[PDB]
Structure formats: structure tokens, C-alpha cells
Amino acid sequence: SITKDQIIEAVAAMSVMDVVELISAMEEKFGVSAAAA
Amino acid sequence: SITKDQIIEAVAAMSVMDVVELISAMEEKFGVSAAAA
């Protein structure tokens, strides 16, 4: 059960800070940081 | 091994579209909409 929603609840499982790091990683990885960074 | 990094490769494992829906999901859920943010 690896649904998109299932992932949502994952982000709502950790702290905001922990999510900042996650998103930050993707930002650099996928190099898609062009939206009010 | 539910590490942040492990999740990174997860977002790079799915299709762009699937990722679009995801991002869009959280966007609404967490309502993190700050004028194109």
C-alpha cells in the first residue's frame, strides 16, 4: 500500500524540521528549487 | 530502513506525473500555498 496518500500521512508523522530536510534533499537532488525557496 | 534519504530515492522511483499529484496533494492537505510556494 504505497499510495500517494499513504505518503502524505508520512510527512504528517514527522516534525516540520524533519520535513524541511527531506524537501531540501529533493530540492537539490531533483534540482527543482524555483518556487519561493 | 525508513530513513529520509530512503524516501528520496522513493520520489525518484516514481513517475513525474505521480510526483506531481503527490506534491499537489500535500500542497492542499498541509495547505502550504503561499502564492507559488
UniProtKB/Swiss-Prot annotation, chains A, B:
The keyword Ribonucleoprotein applies. GO terms for cellular component: cytoplasm; cytosol; cytosolic large ribosomal subunit; large ribosomal subunit. Acetylation of Ser-1 converts L12 to L7. Keywords: Acetylation, Methylation, Ribonucleoprotein, Ribosomal protein. The modification N-acetylserine is found at S1. Disulfide bonds: none annotated. One of its GO terms (molecular function) is structural constituent of ribosome. One of its GO terms (biological process) is cytoplasmic translation. Ribosomal protein L8 appears to be an aggregate of ribosomal proteins L7/L12 and L10. Homodimer. Part of the 50S ribosomal subunit; present in 4 copies per ribosome. L7/L12 forms dimers with an elongated shape. Two dimers associate with a copy of L10 to form part of the ribosomal stalk (called L8). The ribosomal stalk helps the ribosome interact with GTP-bound translation factors. Forms a pentameric L10(L12)2(L12)2 complex, where L10 forms an elongated spine to which 2 L12 dimers bind in a sequential fashion. Belongs to the bacterial ribosomal protein bL12 family. This is Large ribosomal subunit protein bL12. It comes from Escherichia coli (strain K12). The gene is rplL. The chain holds residues 2 to 38 of 121 of the full protein.
